[PDB]
Structures are given as structure tokens and as C-alpha cells.
Amino acid sequence: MKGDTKVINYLNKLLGNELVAINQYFLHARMFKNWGLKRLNDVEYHESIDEMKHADRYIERILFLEGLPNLQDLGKLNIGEDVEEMLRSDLALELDGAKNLREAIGYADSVHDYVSRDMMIEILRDEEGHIDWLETELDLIQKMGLQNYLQAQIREEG
Amino acid sequence: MKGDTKVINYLNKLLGNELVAINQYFLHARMFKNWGLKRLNDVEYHESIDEMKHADRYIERILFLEGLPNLQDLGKLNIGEDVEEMLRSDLALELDGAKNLREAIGYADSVHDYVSRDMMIEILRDEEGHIDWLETELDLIQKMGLQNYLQAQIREEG
Amino acid sequence: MKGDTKVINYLNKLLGNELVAINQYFLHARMFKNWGLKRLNDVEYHESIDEMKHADRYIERILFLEGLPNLQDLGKLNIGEDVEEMLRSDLALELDGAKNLREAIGYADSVHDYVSRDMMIEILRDEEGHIDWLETELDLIQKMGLQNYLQAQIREEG
Amino acid sequence: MKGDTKVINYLNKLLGNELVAINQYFLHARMFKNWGLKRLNDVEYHESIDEMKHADRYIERILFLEGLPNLQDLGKLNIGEDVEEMLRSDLALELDGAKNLREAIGYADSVHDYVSRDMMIEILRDEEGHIDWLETELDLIQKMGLQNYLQAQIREEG
Amino acid sequence: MKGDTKVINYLNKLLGNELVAINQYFLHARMFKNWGLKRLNDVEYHESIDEMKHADRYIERILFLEGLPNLQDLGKLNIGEDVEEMLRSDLALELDGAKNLREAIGYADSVHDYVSRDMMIEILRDEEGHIDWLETELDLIQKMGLQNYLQAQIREEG
Amino acid sequence: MKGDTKVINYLNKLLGNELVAINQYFLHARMFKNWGLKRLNDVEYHESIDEMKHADRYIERILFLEGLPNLQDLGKLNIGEDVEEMLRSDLALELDGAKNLREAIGYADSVHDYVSRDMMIEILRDEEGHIDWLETELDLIQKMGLQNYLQAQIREEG
Amino acid sequence: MKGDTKVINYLNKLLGNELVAINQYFLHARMFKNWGLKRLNDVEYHESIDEMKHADRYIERILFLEGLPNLQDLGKLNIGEDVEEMLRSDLALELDGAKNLREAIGYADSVHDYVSRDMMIEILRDEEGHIDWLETELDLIQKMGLQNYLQAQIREEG
Numbered sequence A, B, C, D, E, F, G: 001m002k003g004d005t006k007v008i009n010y011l012n013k014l015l016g017n018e019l020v021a022i023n024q025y026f027l028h029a030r031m032f033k034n035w036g037l038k039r040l041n042d043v044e045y046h047e048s049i050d051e052m053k054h055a056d057r058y059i060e061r062i063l064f065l066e067g068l069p070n071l072q073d074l075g076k077l078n079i080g081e082d083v084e085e086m087l088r089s090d091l092a093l094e095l096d097g098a099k100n101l102r103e104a105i106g107y108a109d110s111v112h113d114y115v116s117r118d119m120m121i122e123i124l125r126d127e128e129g130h131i132d133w134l135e136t137e138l139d140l141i142q143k144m145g146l147q148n149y150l151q152a153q154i155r156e157e158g
């Protein structure tokens, strides 16, 4: 079904966001794993899988709408060298994507692409979830201190 | 453990190869899926997962060897517009990566990084497997003709 | 038990036939497999196993009859380069072996080696079965055409 | 994938070795069985199956590398007339094949056919295993004497 | 159904053979058992049961063909006083019966009693099996010596 | 099979390394256990078992190659009096053994003892694993502080 | 709990005995295994595990008593080149350790270290068991002769 061009541009832009997130989350995950921070590896890995699911949904939708999914261009990764810096970087990234999602959703509504909108709102709900988790972790680091926070990541949560 | 610098460069280059393959295979997969070529979607999807496993192994190894995995730079994707063109493009990609793998393996041996070598030989064996599958599909297309080949992709293989 | 010498010669000759068939069927099988003709690989492989069972029975019988099984001499393989040619070659081979079997059976009867005869008649019945299958495949190729025939070999039969 | 020609020659030569071993082990097996040496029949039979697995791997690899597997030429079998002679003959055969394998492995490495190499190293490890078993049996025959050794072969090992 | 008279004579003669074998095998069995040669008792007992099955088949066939089964006349038993002598005696007996069977089979064919023939060929195959076993035991006795052979009969084979 | 003498010397030297590691890991384990550091006892104990498996493989291989395994000479243990010191000492030991392994592997390749090489590469991969674990623990001690690190060892990991 | 110094010296001396036994039994085991003496490998291996258990108990007890377990010094191994010699050597070793154990037990009683005593008496009971087994094997070798004894080791005991 031939979709609205600008919706497809938005879908590719959102896809672009998820594909930086996929990589940034995966590197973070295995960095944590290397450091023995088993629990942060588990969560961030699962967030990488999450963003993959999102990318998949965009790709399928762009294809359905008869556009060309763009997996060639990759935005700036910001990796960071310590836990806080890396968590903070994932948070900034989620925040910029939420912003883009809010914009795309409003526009999809105005051209009547209600199913693209509906798919985007579910994705935003997952992002808003990641935002919740990242914010909480960052606050825990301040409240309990860095040493205690690290000790609490050594064992995976059952 | 501080690894050999040039081994790490090779590992990042190989990682680079897998990360273009991951995307190219995934897009191909969902293109096939959109076209209703269910079987080609199943196989190519499973090859995308495969290349992810490889990327993961490189990332973990670079990290262990104390280098910086590079997920920022992404090489040229070549997507193609029909089945043959797309299969042929995946084949050219596997062929270039096999070449890089052969080179890296020889060098790892000469600096005594036998475990990096061992990991790379297993990966090359998986690639060589994908090469086998792609070559066979491309020959089937010529032997049975394009129409018959497409009909044979409509149902997933149990 | 000391057997009739000429029966043993026949047994070795028949053994010789099975041992060329074993190899020819196995190579054909893996050629088909390489080409992705999964179904022809399954059947021809199972025919290779079949001829092995036959060879085993000859070997045991020659030994029981106190002769020397001959596994040293190997007759002409005729491999062929395409499906028809290869199928036709297996058929010619079965036909020559059936001829030898008919001759050996008649002779075993006339020297009263009824158990060798009985074993040979069961083998001939298996060969006659392979002959049936090969003839049918070759006719299917003409009736449905080569392209359709090949497409029909891509998936293994459950 | 077009392989190195000389690698293919080596693969065919190794294949040639396995195919003499297949037959020599099988005849030995059924000779032992006829003599009631149940245990030697069980082991040697299982070694025949082993060499078949090896031949299969060569055949598939030659085919993948786009060469012509050679099952037509069969090297000298040396059967022998008693246990020691026959065991010793299998040992000489394994020793010559190990020699060929060592040469092929070194050459595969130097043309970068690392997966052929990897396959060959696993095969050599199985051969080295057969060598171990044969050497041990031959020493047992001297240590316990031939009569005791034979009595020990009458019952199959659970 | 009124059978050929001479076929019935042959059937009774063969029956006569089995009925001496039944007794000779049973006595041998329980002699071995008494001597503690548990394994030879197991096998020879099972051969006695075997010959009973054969007698049964003759009896039923003679009756079907409307003749009178003869269980009154019993040929010469040759018991023997030691293992070798007794094994050798069972072997001579099987050899004479195989001779009779060969003759009967040829004659049944020439009067078209194909089912009597078919029954006789299966019996001959069982006899040929007993012949194999006896020959092997007698050769084992020479190869491993009498003392070792006896020790090997003390425990039953699982 | 008569092996290369210098390969056997290397195998004995590597065996020597594993046998110091076996003892050093076991003492460390039970020291941790005594101190109530349950988790460090579990891991180090499992590393002692690991090094035993390695010693076993060397011993068997030396024996196969017809050399004399040397379990008489035992290198310097360095025990240490606190967690860091003891972990650091295990790390120095793994590092020296990895060095020896790298040398032995290269030499085995040059005399064509590919199966010894293959066994050594698997062992090196296990060592490289222990190196990873030790390095991570030592870094955790600095990152979370000694008191927090110790508290984290009190309970065994499920 | 601060133990008696001389008890700790005894514990270390006994530990020293077990650690030579561990190695001597393990080498013997794998020597038997190499020779195909499967049964002697099974038993001696299990005795090596046994002596490890003993070493473990000493190590834990020395640590509890606040002494320093000594795994650095290793007494004279006496390996031997044939079965008898090797069995005899394990027996001499058990005999010397039993002597040391008797001495240590008496002394532990006189300084009131009743739990060390109790642990040592259980160990002595296990040693006395090994002594029983070794003595019996050595006598069996004389009673049945070396050839028969070896044949009896070829199969593992269920």
C-alpha cells in the first residue's frame, strides 16, 4: 500500500535511532560483562534485543508502505568510559528518540496513518520504560554511592 | 590481558564485516518476507542471527584483549532490487569477509594469538557454510528457472 | 564348510558389483546434496547403505564357505555430469548386476548351494526395487520436464 | 567456492587412504567374526564406520571446493592370515595415512585453507586414536600370549 | 491335499535326522551342564529346541500332505565322552543332514512341491548356521587350547 | 607412537606448570573457605579441578607418545597471605604458563604434531579464561573496595 | 583455634605422604590405561581420588588449627616399569604412611587433640583398605601367573 512519504521519512529516522541504540546498548552490555558487572550486562543486553525488535517493526512497516528502509546511515554513538557516563549516555539517547517519536506520532495522526501511529505509541511506551530504568539506576548510584552500587551488580538477578 | 594491537585491528575489521552482513541479511530477509518468499526470509533471518553471534564473539574478544570495539563505522551495504541481485550481493560480501578472515588467521598465528585464531577459524567455517548455501541457491535459480524457483520459496521448510 | 569354488567366484563377482555400486551411489548422493537436490541425496544415500548390506552378506558368506573375499579389485565407475546422465548410469549398473545375479542363482541351484541361492534371490529382489525407482525417476524427468523435476527435489520427503 | 587445486589433490589422496582402510577394516572385522573373535569384530567394524565418516567428509569438501572426488582408484589392501598379521597391517596403514595427513595439513595452512586444515586435524586425531588401540592390542598379544589373547576376544565388551 | 509319495519319504527321512539331533543335542547340553560348562549347555540346549521346531514343521507338513509321520525309528546317536568328541559328533550329524536336505530340496523342485521346498530351504539355512557355530567352536579349541577353552565356558553369555 | 622428544619435553614442562597450579589453587580455595569467603572457595576449587583435567591430558599424551611423564619435580608455589596477594599470585602463574603454552604450540606445529598442538590450544583457551576471571576479580577489588569485595564472597553463587 | 605445633607438623607430614601417593597412583593408573589394563586403571584412579580426599582433610584441619599446609615439598616417587614393580611400590608407600599415621595418632591422643586423632583413624582405615587390595593383587599375580593376571585386567569390572 503506497504510504505517505513523510511518514516513511519519519519511520527511517526512528529506525536510525534504534539502530544506534542497538549497538550502543550491546557494547555497553559486554563492557559491563567484561568488568564482571553481570547484572548490568543482563539488563543492557535485553535492551539491545528490545531495540532490535523495534527496528524490525519499522523495517517491516516501511516495506509494507513501499519505502526503502535505510540501514546504511548510522548516527553518533557515545560510548563513555565508566558506568555513570555510559548509563547517562544511553539516557540522553532515549530522550532524543522519545522526542523524535513524539513528533512522528503527531504527524502520522494528521495524515491519518493510524496504524503507523499505533505501532509508534507502543514503541514509545517501551522507551519510556527504558528511560524509567536508566533514571532509577543513575539515582541509585548517588544514593548508595558508587562502590556499593558496583557490588550490587556482581550477581545476576534471578 | 593486553593483546597484540594489530590483532585487535583485525578483530575490529572482521567485526566491521559482520556488522554490514547483519544489516544486509536482515533487510534481505524482510524484503523476501514482504514479497511472500517465506523460505528465503527464514534462512536469511537465521543468517543475520548468525552474524550477530560472530559480532558478539569479536566484541568480547577485543574487550578481553583490552581494545576498543568499533561499532561506529559501517561499510557499504549493497541491497539490490531482485532475488538474484540480492543473493549475489550477500555472496560477494561473504567472499570479501572470507578473504579478510584468511589474512587475520595467518597473522594471529604468527604473533602466537592462538585463541583468537581458533575463534576465527570457527567463524570462517560458518561463513564457508553461508557461501555454500548462497552458491547453491544461485545455481538453482538457473537450473530450474526464476518462476519455479520463486514458487519453491512460498512455503517455509519444516 | 568348504563351498563350491565356482559359487565363491560368483559371490566375489557379485561382491565386486556391489562395491562399485556403493561408491557410485554415495558420490551421486553427495553430488545431489551439493546441488541442493536434497531428496535425491536422501534416496541415493539410502541406496548406498543398501549395497553395503549386500556386500556384507556376500563377504560373510564367502568367509563361511571358506573362500577369500576380494575387496581389492574395483570395476569401472561411470559418474556422469548431470542428473539424467547420473541416474542412467546407476540404472545401467543395476542392469548388469541383475544379469550376473541371474547367472549366479541358476548355477548355485545346479550345485545344490540352496542357501547361497536364497540369499542371492533376496538381493536380486532389492536390486529389482532400485531398478524400479531409477526407471520411474528417469520417466518423470521426461514427463514433467527437467526444470520441474529439479524443483521437486529441493525438499526432503517426510 | 573454487578451492586450491593441490588441496583438492591432497583431499583425494587422503580419501584414497580412507577407502582402502574402510575395506581392510571391514574384511578384518568379518574374518574375526567368522573365527568367533566377537570383540575384535565389534571394534574393527566400528573402525570401518569411522573411516566411512572420514571419506564422507572428504567427498563433501572436495565437492564444495569444486573438485572431482576420486572413488575409482583403490590402493593396495594387505589382508594377512592371522590376528597379529592383520592387526599389524591395519597399523602400517594408519601410519602411512597419518604421514599423508601431516603433509596435507601443513600445505592447507600455507595456502590459507584453514577449514580444510581444521577438518583434517580432527580426522588425524581419530586416526591417532586408532593407532593407540592397535598398538595396545599388539602389545597385549605379546604380554599375555596369543592363546590368552584370543580367549579374551570371544565375548563382546558391554 | 495328497502329496507326492517320495516327497513324504524324504520328509520322514529328514524328520528322522532331526529327531536324532534333538536327543543328541539335549544329552550333550546336560552333560556340559553337569560339567559346569554353563555356556555350552545354553547353546546346545537352544539347538535342541531348534531341531524340535524343525521336527514339528516336518510333522505338520507330512500330515497336511496326507502321509504318516514316522517317530518310531531312531537313527544312531553318537554321544562321545569329551567336549571335542561331542562337538565333532554334532558336526558330523549336521553334515549328513545337510546332505539329505540338499537331495530332498532338488527332488521337491522337480515334482513341483515348491512349498515343501521352501520350508526345507529355511531349515537348511538354520542347519548351515549350526554348522558355522560348531566349526568355530572346534577351531577355538585348537587356537586357544583346551584348558582356556573350558574356562571360557564356565559363565553364561549375557 | 614414538613422538618428537622436544614435544615431550614441552608436554612435561606444561604438565609441571599445571601441577603447581593444581596445588596453589587448592590451598587458595581452602584458605578462602576457612576465612568464610565461600564464593572464592567455590571458584578456586573448580579451577584446581580444571588444572587436574589438563594434567591428565598431558600425562595421557606423553604416555601415548612414549615418553615418561614427570610428576616428581614441583616448581615454586607462591601462596600469599591476603586475598589480593593470592589472586595476583594465581594470575602471575597463569601468565607464565600461557607464555610456555604459546611457545610449545608453535613448536608442535613446526614438527607436525598437530594433535598435540590441538590439545594445547584448547588448554590455552581454558587458561585465558582463568586469566579473564582473575583480572576481573582484581579490578573489582579496587573498584568497590576491599571491605565490599569481601562481603560479596560470603555467600555461594547459585 | 590454635592447635598443638607438633600435631600440625604431623598433619603436614601425613599430607606430604598423601601427596606423593596422589601422583604415584595417578601415573600408575594412566600407565595401566595406556597398556589397556582397563581394570587396574579404574582401581588406581579411584585410589588417587581417595588420597586427594585425605589431603583435603589434612589441609582443612591444619588451616583450622592455624598452621600452614605445606604443598611445596614432594617426597620420592618410585614409579617402576612393570605391573608387579608398580604395585609393590604403591604397597611400600602405603606401609610407610601407615607407620607415620600410627605415630601421629598416638601423639594426638597424648596432647588431647581427639578430633585430629579421630580424623586420622578414619584415614588409616582407608589406607589399611588399600594395603589389603594391593597385597591381594600381588598374591593373585603369583597364584594365577602374570599372563593370566594381565588378561583379567583387560575389561573393567561392572
Ligand code: HEM
Pocket: A019, A022, A023, A026, A049, A052, A053, A055, A056, B019, B022, B023, B026, B049, B052, B053, B055, B056
Ligand atoms: C549489529 C549489532 C548487533 C548485535 C551485536 C546483535 C546481537 C544479537 C544477539 C546476540 C542476539 C541473540 C540471538 C538469538 O536470538 O538467540 C540477537 C537477536 C536478534 N536480533 Fe540482533 N544484534 C545486532 C543488530 C541487529 C539488527 C540491526 C537487527 C535488525 C533490525 C537485529 C535483529 C534481531 C532479532 C529480530 C533477534 C531475535 C530476538 C529474540 O527473539 O530473542 N539485530 N541479536
Ligand code: HEM
Pocket: C019, C022, C023, C026, C049, C052, C053, C055, C056, D019, D022, D023, D026, D049, D052, D053, D055, D056, D059
Ligand atoms: C565397500 C565396502 C563397505 C562396506 C562393506 C560398508 C558397510 C557398512 C555397513 C554394514 C553400514 C551400516 C548401515 C547403517 O548405517 O545402518 C555402513 C554405514 C555407513 N556407510 Fe558404509 N561400507 C562400505 C563402504 C562405504 C563407503 C565407500 C562410504 C562412502 C564414503 C560409506 C559410507 C557410509 C556411511 C555414511 C554410513 C552411516 C554410518 C552411521 O551413521 O552409522 N561406506 N557401512
Ligand code: HEM
Pocket: E019, E022, E023, E026, E049, E052, E053, E055, E056
Ligand atoms: C525326547 C527327548 C526330548 C527332550 C529331552 C526335550 C526337551 C524339551 C524341553 C526341556 C523343552 C522346554 C519346555 C518348554 O517349552 O518350556 C522342550 C520344548 C519343546 N519341545 Fe522338546 N524334547 C525332546 C523331544 C521333542 C520332540 C520329539 C518333539 C516333537 C517334534 C519336541 C517338541 C518340542 C516343542 C515344540 C517345544 C517348545 C519350544 C519352545 O517354544 O520353547 N521335543 N523340549
Ligand code: HEM
Pocket: F019, F022, F023, F026, F049, F052, F053, F055, F056, G019, G022, G023, G026, G049, G052, G053, G055, G056
Ligand atoms: C595434590 C593435591 C590435590 C588435591 C588436594 C586434589 C583434590 C581433589 C578433589 C577433592 C577432587 C574431588 C573428588 C571427586 O572427583 O569427587 C579431585 C578430583 C580429581 N582429581 Fe585431584 N587433587 C590433587 C591433585 C591431583 C593430581 C596431581 C591429579 C592428576 C593429574 C588429579 C586428578 C584428578 C581428577 C582427574 C579428578 C576428577 C575431576 C572430576 O571429574 O570431578 N588431582 N581432586
